[PDB]
Design a protein around this ligand. Structure first.
Ligand SMILES: CC(C)c1ccccc1O
Ligand SMILES: CC(C)c1ccccc1O
Lengths: 168, 168, 168, 168
């Protein structure tokens, strides 16, 4: 690329992999959202929580793709693997799966940051710090807070209803 | 001091001690606030309740220091002892500790008022009555009300969640 | 902690130490502020300057404590040592002591940043850069500017009055 | 009086004496104000400072007289002695004389409060605390602050001009 400068092939590939991870996460959240919209699950606050996260993860992927082009790298897309479950159990189960997912995304961000540091790519490092790393820490703290409240509420049906009504 | 009039060395020293007590109380409330912000505690209403009290106690100390200077006394600061606990247990435990703390502050105010009366210092007496004594009585009544509601709510997890959601 | 990820015990402890340093600095500024409010000192602009700094340092400590919880670390508080002086001398003396204090806080921030870099903790590194490092550089530049103006003004009483009236 | 209740002849007389003291103080401040308005003195800020105090002391006297009537006592007026000086010297001299005057008024208030306490007259005690004692403490602190600034400014002519321009 005529514009490419200080942008390694290793980072370019890792960015494409991270796009795939963010799109997969968006897909997982889409599935979580619609599961909580089932008439036999019917927790609207939980559905809304996960639909908003599907939106956030898609936006993350789009920001990465914008950055790939800004740097002169080439976006390459792969299949998006279907989510790991078809049914997501209770709100507690779902929130546990969400924190597992976010910790994996965070680890991928940290790995990419390490790669950028190793490659002396400060634009990449700053981009991640500015748009992704703090967003992830805040979201994981919020999920942990939710998990703690859900756990203290387990008369499990009553507790699940109250959390959806009064927290979400 | 060129302005000092009817202001005993005994009152001046007791005011400095009371500043220290109010700052210690602010510090204790700071610790309480952040404990309830822990991801494994996660009671935001409780965190907010104690953070607002940390602010109130600091403001109290500052008012005392302003008064010390208005009277021509000299502020003298001492170390602030760390709070008595590192972890504060349940909301019930915390509210019990808060009422113990406020009763101690109130007793110190009453002791200082008695000293002012003994020293025939009506400005001091009025200052305490106007800015501190009623504030303390109101706060202790509110804490007692909270303690009673928390106690009636002990399915203890459920009760702790509902109090934070519906009262705080 | 269920949320803790890439957050070393070394950083967690250093953050707690830095909270203590920021709270100690707030306390020092509280003492400076009230000294300049003494009827026999009576430099209101100087009092206001240091009271605003006491507020800034407390806010810094609170931001650190918020971050400690976001990362899944545990806040631990220690005694707050009383300020190093009971009386602070002239505005020049006070401003010299303030720059010494800020340079110490800045060094602690730089030490913690180095630790974060060594531990490959980019969230910590970014947090400090974003909220603390530039704030410190700006404040130290402002103090240095003030020190230079105070020094050029030493008829020392006249100079002290004019600085408080026309700069602060 | 048909309305008089718990109001001793001793307090009634002391209130009349205190009215006289407040009116005398107003007169003294009137003289101070106009001295600083002399073409060969010409310190407008100082003139304004003392004219506002003449107003405050007259208002104090009127509040006392209103209270005397509310309690069923009988106002009795005496001659108002002319102020102690015809010419008031420098701003420093004047501010020294003003603090002497206010300390005397404050002592009279404290004496009357003691008398009210001895006579078990809480309405009197509260009236003084609410309308006079804190006003006096604040005014004496302000005068002490002014005296300190005037003293640090003594090139005495230059210092007198700057204080009037930049403080008053
Ligand atoms: C003394 C001030 C700075 C303080 C210390 C600790 C906790 C809260 C405070 O306001
Ligand atoms: C007593 C009133 C009329 C009075 C006299 C002298 C100076 C000021 C005053 O308000």
């Amino acid at each position: 690329s005529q514009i490419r400068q200080n942008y390694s092939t290793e980072v370019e590939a890792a960015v494409n992999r991270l796009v795939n991870l963010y799109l997969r996460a968006s897909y997982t959240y889409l599935s979580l959202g619609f599961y909580f919209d089932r008439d036999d699950v019917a927790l609207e606050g939980v559905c809304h929580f996960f639909r908003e996260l599907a939106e956030e993860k898609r936006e993350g992927a789009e920001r990465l793709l914008k950055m790939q082009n800004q740097r002169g790298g080439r976006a390459l897309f792969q299949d998006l693997q279907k989510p790991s479950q078809d049914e997501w159990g209770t709100t507690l189960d779902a929130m546990k799966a969400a924190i597992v997912l976010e910790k994996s995304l965070n680890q991928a961000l940290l790995d990419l940051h390490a790669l950028g540091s190793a490659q002396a790519d400060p634009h990449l490092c700053d981009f991640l710090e500015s748009h992704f790393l703090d967003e992830e820490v805040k979201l994981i703290k919020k999920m942990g807070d939710h998990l703690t409240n859900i756990q203290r509420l387990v008369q499990a049906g009553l507790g699940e209803y109250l959390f959806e009504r009064l927290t979400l």
